[PDB]
Short mmCIF file of C-alpha atoms and ligand atoms in Angstrom, two decimals:
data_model
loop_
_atom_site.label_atom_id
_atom_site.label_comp_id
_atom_site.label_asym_id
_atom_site.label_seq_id
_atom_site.Cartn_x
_atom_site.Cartn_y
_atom_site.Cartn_z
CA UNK U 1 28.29 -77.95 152.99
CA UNK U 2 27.32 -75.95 149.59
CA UNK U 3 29.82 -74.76 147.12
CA UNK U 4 30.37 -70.78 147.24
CA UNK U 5 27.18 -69.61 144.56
CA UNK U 6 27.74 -66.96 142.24
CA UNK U 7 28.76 -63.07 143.06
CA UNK U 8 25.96 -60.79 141.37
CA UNK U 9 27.87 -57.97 139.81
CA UNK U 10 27.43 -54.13 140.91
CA UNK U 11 25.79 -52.31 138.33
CA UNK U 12 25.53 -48.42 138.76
CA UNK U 13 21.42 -47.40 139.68
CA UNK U 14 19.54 -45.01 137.04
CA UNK U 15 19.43 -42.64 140.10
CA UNK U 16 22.75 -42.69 141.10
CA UNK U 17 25.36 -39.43 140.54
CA UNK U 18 26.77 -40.17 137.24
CA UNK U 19 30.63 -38.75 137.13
CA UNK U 20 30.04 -35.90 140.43
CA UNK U 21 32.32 -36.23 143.64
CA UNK U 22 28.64 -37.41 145.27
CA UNK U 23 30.70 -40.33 146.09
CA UNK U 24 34.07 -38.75 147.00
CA UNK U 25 35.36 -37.85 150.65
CA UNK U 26 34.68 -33.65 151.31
CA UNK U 27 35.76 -34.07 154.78
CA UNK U 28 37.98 -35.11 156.70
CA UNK U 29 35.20 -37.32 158.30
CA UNK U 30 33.81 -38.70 155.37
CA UNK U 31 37.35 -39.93 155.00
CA UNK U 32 37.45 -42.06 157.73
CA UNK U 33 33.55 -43.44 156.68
CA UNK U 34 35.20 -44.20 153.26
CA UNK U 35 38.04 -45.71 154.83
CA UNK U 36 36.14 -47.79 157.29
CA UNK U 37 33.87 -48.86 154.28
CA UNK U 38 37.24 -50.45 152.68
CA UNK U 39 37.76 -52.29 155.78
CA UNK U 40 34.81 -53.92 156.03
CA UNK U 41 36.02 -56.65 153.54
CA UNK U 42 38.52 -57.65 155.75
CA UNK U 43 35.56 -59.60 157.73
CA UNK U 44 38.01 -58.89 160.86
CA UNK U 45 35.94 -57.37 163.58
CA UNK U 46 39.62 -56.56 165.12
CA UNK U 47 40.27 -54.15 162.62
CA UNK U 48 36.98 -52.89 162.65
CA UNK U 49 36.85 -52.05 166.27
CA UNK U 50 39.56 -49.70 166.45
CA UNK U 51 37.23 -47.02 164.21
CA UNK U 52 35.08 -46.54 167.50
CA UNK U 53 34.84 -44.77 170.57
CA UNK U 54 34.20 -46.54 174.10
CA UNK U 55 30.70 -44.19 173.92
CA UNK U 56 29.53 -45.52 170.72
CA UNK U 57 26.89 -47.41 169.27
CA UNK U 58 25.75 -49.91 166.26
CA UNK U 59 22.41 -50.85 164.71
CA UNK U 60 21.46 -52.96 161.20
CA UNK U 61 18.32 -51.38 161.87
CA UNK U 62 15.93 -54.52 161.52
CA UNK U 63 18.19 -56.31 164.56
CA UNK U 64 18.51 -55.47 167.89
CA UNK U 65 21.46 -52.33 168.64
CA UNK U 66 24.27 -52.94 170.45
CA UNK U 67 25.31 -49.28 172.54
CA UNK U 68 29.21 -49.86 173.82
CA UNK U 69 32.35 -50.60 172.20
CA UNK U 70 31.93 -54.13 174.01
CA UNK U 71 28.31 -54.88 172.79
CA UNK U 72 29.55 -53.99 168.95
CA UNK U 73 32.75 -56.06 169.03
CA UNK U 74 30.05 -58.40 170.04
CA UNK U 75 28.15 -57.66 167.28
CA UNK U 76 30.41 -57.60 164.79
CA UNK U 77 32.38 -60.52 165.63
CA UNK U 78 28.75 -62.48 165.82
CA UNK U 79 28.04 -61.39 162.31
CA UNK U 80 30.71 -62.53 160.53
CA UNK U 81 30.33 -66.01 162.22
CA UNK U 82 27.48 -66.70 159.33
CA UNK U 83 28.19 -63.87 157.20
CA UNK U 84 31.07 -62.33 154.97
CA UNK U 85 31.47 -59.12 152.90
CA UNK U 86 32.74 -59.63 149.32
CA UNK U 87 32.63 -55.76 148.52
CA UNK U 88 31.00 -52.59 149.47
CA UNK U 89 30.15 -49.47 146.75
CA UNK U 90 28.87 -46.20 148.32
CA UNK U 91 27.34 -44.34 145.48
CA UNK U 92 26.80 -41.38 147.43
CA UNK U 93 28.31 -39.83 150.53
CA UNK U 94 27.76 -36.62 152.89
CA UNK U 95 28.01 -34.86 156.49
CA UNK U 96 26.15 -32.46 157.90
CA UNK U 97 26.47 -31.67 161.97
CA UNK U 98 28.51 -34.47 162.89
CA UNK U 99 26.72 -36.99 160.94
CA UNK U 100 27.95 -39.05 157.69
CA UNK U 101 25.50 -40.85 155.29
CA UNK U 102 26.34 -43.43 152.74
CA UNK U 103 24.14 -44.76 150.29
CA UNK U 104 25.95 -48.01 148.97
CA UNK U 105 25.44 -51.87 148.01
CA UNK U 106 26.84 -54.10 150.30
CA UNK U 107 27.53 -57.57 148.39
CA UNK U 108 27.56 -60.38 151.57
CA UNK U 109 27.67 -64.17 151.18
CA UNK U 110 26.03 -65.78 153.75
CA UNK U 111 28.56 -68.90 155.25
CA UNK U 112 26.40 -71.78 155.80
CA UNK U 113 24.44 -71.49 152.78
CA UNK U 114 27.83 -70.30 150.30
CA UNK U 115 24.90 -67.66 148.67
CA UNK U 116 25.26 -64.39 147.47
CA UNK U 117 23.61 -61.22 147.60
CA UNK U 118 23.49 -57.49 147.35
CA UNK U 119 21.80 -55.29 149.99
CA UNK U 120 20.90 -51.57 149.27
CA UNK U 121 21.86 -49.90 152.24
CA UNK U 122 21.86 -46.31 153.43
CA UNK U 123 23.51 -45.91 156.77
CA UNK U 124 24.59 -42.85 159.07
CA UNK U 125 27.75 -42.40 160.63
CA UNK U 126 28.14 -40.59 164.14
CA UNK U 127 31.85 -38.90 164.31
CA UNK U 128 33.66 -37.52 167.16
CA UNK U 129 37.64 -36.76 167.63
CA UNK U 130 37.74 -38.92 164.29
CA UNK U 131 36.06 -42.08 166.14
CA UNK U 132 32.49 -43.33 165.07
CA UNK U 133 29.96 -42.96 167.99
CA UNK U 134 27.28 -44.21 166.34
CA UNK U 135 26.18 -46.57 162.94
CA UNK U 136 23.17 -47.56 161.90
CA UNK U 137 22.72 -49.23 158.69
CA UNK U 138 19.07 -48.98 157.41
CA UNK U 139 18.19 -52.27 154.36
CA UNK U 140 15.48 -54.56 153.90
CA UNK U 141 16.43 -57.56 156.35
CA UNK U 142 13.59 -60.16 154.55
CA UNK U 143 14.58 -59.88 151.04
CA UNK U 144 18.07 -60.61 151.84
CA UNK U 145 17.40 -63.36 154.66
CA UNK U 146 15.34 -65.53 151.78
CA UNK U 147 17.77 -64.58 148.51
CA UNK U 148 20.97 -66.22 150.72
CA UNK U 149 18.08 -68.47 153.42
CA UNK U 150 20.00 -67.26 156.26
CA UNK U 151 16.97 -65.89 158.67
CA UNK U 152 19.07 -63.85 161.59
CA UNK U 153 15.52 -62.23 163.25
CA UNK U 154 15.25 -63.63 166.54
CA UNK Q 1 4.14 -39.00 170.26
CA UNK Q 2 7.64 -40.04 169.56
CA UNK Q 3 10.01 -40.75 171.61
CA UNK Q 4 13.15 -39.95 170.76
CA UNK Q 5 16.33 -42.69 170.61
CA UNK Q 6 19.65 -42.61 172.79
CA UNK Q 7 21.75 -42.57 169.50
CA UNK Q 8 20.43 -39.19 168.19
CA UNK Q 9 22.98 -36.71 168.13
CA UNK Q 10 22.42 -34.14 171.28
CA UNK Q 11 23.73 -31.20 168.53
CA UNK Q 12 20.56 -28.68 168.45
CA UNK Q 13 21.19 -28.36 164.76
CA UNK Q 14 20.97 -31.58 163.81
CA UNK Q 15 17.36 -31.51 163.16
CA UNK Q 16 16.97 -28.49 161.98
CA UNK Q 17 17.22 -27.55 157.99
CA UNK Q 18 20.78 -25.63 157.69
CA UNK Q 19 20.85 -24.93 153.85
CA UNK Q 20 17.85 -24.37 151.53
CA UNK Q 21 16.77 -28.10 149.96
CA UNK Q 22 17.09 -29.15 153.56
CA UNK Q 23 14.04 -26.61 154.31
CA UNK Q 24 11.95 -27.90 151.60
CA UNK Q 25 12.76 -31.54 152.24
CA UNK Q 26 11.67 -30.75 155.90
CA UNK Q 27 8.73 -29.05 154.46
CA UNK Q 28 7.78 -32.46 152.12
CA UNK Q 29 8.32 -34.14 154.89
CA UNK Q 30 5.59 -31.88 156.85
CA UNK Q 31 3.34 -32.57 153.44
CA UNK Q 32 3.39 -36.48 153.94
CA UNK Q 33 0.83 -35.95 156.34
CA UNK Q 34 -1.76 -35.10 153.91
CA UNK Q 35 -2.02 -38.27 152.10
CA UNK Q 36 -2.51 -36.34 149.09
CA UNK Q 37 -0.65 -37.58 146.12
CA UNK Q 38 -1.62 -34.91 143.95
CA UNK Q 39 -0.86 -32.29 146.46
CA UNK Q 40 3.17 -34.45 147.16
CA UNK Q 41 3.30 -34.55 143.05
CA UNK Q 42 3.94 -30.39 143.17
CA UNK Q 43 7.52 -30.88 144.95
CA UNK Q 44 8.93 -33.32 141.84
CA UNK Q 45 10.79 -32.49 138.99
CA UNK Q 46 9.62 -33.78 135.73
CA UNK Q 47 12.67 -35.75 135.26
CA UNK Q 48 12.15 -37.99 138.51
CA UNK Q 49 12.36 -40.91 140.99
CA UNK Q 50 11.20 -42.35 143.93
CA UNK Q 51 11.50 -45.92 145.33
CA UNK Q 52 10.62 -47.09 148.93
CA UNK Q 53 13.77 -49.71 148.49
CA UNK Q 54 11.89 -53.08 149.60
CA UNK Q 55 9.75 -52.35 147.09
CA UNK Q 56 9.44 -51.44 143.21
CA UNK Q 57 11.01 -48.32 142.20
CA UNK Q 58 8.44 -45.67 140.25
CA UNK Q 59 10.50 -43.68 137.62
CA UNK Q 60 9.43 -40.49 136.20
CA UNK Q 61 6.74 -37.26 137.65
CA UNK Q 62 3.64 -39.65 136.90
CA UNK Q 63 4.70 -43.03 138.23
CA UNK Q 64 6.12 -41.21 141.72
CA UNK Q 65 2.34 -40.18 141.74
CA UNK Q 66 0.31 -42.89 140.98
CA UNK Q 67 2.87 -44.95 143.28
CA UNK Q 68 2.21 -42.42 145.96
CA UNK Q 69 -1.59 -42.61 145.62
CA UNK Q 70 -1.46 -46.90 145.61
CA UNK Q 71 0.03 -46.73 148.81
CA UNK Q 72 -2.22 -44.16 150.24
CA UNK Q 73 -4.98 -46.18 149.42
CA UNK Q 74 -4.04 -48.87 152.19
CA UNK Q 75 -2.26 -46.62 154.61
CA UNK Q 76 -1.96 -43.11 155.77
CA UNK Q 77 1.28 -40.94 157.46
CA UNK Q 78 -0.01 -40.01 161.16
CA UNK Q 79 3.37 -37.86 162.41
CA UNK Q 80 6.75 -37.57 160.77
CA UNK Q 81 9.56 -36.59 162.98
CA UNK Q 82 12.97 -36.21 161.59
CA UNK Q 83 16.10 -36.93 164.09
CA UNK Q 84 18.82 -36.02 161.71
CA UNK Q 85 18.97 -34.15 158.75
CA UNK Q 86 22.27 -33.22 156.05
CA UNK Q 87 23.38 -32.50 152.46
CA UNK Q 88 26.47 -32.47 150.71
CA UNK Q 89 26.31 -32.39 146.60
CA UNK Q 90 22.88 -31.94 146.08
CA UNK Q 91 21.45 -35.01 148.07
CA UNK Q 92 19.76 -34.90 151.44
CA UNK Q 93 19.44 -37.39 153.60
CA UNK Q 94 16.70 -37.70 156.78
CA UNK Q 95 17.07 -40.16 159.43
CA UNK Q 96 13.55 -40.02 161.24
CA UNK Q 97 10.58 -41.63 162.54
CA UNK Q 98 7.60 -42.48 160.19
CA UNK Q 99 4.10 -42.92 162.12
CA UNK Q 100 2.31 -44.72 159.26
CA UNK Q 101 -1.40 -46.25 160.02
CA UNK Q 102 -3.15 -49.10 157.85
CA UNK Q 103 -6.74 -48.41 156.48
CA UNK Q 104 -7.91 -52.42 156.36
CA UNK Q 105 -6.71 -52.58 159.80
CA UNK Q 106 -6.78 -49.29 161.37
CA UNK Q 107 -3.40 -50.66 163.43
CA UNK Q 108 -0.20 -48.21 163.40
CA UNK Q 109 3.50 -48.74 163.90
CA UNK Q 110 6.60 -46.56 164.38
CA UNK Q 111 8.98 -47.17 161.45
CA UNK Q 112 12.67 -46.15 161.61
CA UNK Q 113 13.29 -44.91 158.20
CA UNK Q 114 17.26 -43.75 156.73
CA UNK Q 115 16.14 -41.25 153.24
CA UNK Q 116 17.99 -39.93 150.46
CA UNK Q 117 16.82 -36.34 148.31
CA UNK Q 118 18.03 -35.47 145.43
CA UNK Q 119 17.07 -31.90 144.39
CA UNK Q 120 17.75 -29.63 141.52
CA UNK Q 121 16.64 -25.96 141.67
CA UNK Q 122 14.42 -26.95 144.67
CA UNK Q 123 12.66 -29.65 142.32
CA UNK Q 124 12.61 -33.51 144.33
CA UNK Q 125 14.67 -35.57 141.25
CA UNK Q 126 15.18 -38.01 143.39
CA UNK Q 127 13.49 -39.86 146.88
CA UNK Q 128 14.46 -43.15 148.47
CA UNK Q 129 13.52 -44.24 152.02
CA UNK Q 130 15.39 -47.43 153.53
CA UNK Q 131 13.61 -49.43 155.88
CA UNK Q 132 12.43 -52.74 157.04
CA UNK Q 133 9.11 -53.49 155.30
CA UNK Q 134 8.76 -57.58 157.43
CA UNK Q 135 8.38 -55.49 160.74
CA UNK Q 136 5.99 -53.02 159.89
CA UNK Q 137 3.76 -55.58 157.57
CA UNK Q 138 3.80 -57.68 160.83
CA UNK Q 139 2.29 -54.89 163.10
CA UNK Q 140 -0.19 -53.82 161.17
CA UNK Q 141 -0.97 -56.71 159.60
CA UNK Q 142 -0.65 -55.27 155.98
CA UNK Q 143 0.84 -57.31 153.61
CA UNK Q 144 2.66 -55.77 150.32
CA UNK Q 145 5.48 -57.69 149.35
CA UNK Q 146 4.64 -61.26 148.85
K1 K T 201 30.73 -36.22 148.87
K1 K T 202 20.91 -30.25 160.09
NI1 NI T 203 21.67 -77.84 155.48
NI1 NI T 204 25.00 -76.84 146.78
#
């Protein structure tokens, strides 16, 4: 057992939109993506599940994808066996044809290791009748697997 | 060739460029190819960025271009196809393919890349591509983050 390290605080990037609605739901899509975002703290994959269709899909790029609702419960539920979201900040978000984009920080503590760290991530969102078809989430997987020493490839 | 994923949205306009900076962005994207620094430089504002995200980022018009012409001097862009591409608020954002080769090694590998544009009056202020950097290093045997 290791006691819970220390969160690193989220500090606004040089290059991101200063005061602009860049991060602000336009749509009624990017609503949902925003909202989704704020569940993601939970660490519940329950509540997490009920944002997707049965024909949907999910992919942190550098693992493998799980396609089906069943295969992401899966994968969700798997994650947050060893890992757990403290707080995510999407800096910038859009939609074009169907498709939402978030460019955020994920801060994640890693279980068995009580570490801390936060992942730039830009990930898509797939949207259909207000359910998410498809996520992928696209981050560097070794620079966060050695800051918290949690490998997950393989 | 590329094949292209199950995920990708079936919409026919998905790919294609549907509002002006989505055009030249696709166009940029067509100019990777080149491995020409000095000929990439042209689409960037003065006032600039760019950062691959596993790695350093380069801030300002000359930094994006010497950091452009380090990494083409170990590697070279063989095919860029772009799956999805979108804007909202003056940022666009590619989800695509990158075909990138290494010159000490001559191997390639297929690298799923998520990127972020920001553009003012058609000038590239801002570029970041997300991405795995352990998988491709791995393939090609190219090491640049120690
Ligand atoms: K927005
Ligand atoms: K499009
Ligand atoms: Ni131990
Ligand atoms: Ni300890």
């Amino acid at each position: 057992h290791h006691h819970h390290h220390h969160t690193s605080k989220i500090e606004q990037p040089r290059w991101a939109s200063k005061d602009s609605a860049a991060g602000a739901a336009s749509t009624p899509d990017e609503k949902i993506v925003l909202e989704f975002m704020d569940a993601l703290t939970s660490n519940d994959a329950a509540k997490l599940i009920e944002y997707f269709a049965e024909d949907t899909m999910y992919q942190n790029m550098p693992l493998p994808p799980a396609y089906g609702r069943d295969a992401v419960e899966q994968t969700l539920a798997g994650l947050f066996t060893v890992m757990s979201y403290d707080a995510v900040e999407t800096f910038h978000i859009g939609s074009s044809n169907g498709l939402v984009y978030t460019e955020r920080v994920d801060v994640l503590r890693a279980l068995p290791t009580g570490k801390s760290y936060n992942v730039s991530v830009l990930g898509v969102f797939q949207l259909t009748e207000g359910k998410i078809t498809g996520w992928r989430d696209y981050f560097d997987l070794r620079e966060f697997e050695e800051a918290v020493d949690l490998p997950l490839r393989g």
